[PDB]
């Protein structure tokens, strides 16, 4: 988990478009995530892993211990039943709604967190940065 650790800014991103479509968002979400960076400060708090997803318009936080299970109300605008687990040097968060599935593959690649978002066969690879 230690290398994880850091205020994770958005530095190249592949599909910022046909993944919220997909996801079904509201339109004003889809405006958004094409114009704005996300500023990802992944923290341990006192004990628990705190994420702060903060961008100018959106600004949203998970509190989490690895497998905990937790409703989530999230930039779309949806519920997710939300698993965060490492599988192998690699950080999954696991978000389930109505029959449907998203799961967020952060693996550090020489100190930079490259964020492979499956909806299934849709998929956003989203490359952040150390500040």
Same mark, same amino acid.
């Given at each position: 988990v230690?290398?994880?650790?850091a205020?994770?800014?958005? /530095?190249n991103?592949?599909?910022?478009?046909?993944? !919220?479509?997909?996801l079904g968002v =509201?339109?004003?979400?889809?405006?958004?995530?094409?114009?704005?960076?996300?500023?990802v400060?992944?923290?341990?708090? =006192?004990?628990?892993?705190?994420?702060? /997803?903060?961008?100018t318009?959106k600004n949203?936080?998970?509190?989490?211990?690895?497998?905990?299970?937790?409703?989530?109300?999230?930039?779309?605008?949806?519920?997710? $039943?939300?698993?965060?687990?490492?599988? =192998?040097?690699?950080?999954?968060?696991?978000?389930?709604?109505?029959?449907k599935?998203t799961?967020?593959?952060?693996?550090? $690649?020489?100190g930079k !967190?490259?964020?492979t978002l499956?909806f299934?066969?849709?998929?956003?690879?989203?490359?952040?940065? $150390?500040?």
């Amino acid at each position: 988990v230690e290398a994880f650790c850091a205020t994770w800014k958005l /530095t190249n991103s592949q599909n910022f478009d046909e993944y !919220m479509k997909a996801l079904g968002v =509201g339109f004003a979400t889809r405006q958004v995530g094409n114009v704005t960076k996300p500023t990802v400060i992944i923290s341990q708090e =006192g004990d628990k892993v705190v994420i702060r /997803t903060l961008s100018t318009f959106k600004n949203t936080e998970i509190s989490f211990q690895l497998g905990e299970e937790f409703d989530e109300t999230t930039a779309d605008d949806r519920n997710c $039943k939300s698993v965060v687990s490492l599988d =192998g040097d690699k950080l999954v968060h696991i978000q389930k709604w109505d029959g449907k599935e998203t799961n967020f593959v952060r693996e550090i $690649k020489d100190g930079k !967190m490259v964020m492979t978002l499956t909806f299934g066969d849709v998929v956003a690879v989203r490359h952040y940065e $150390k500040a």
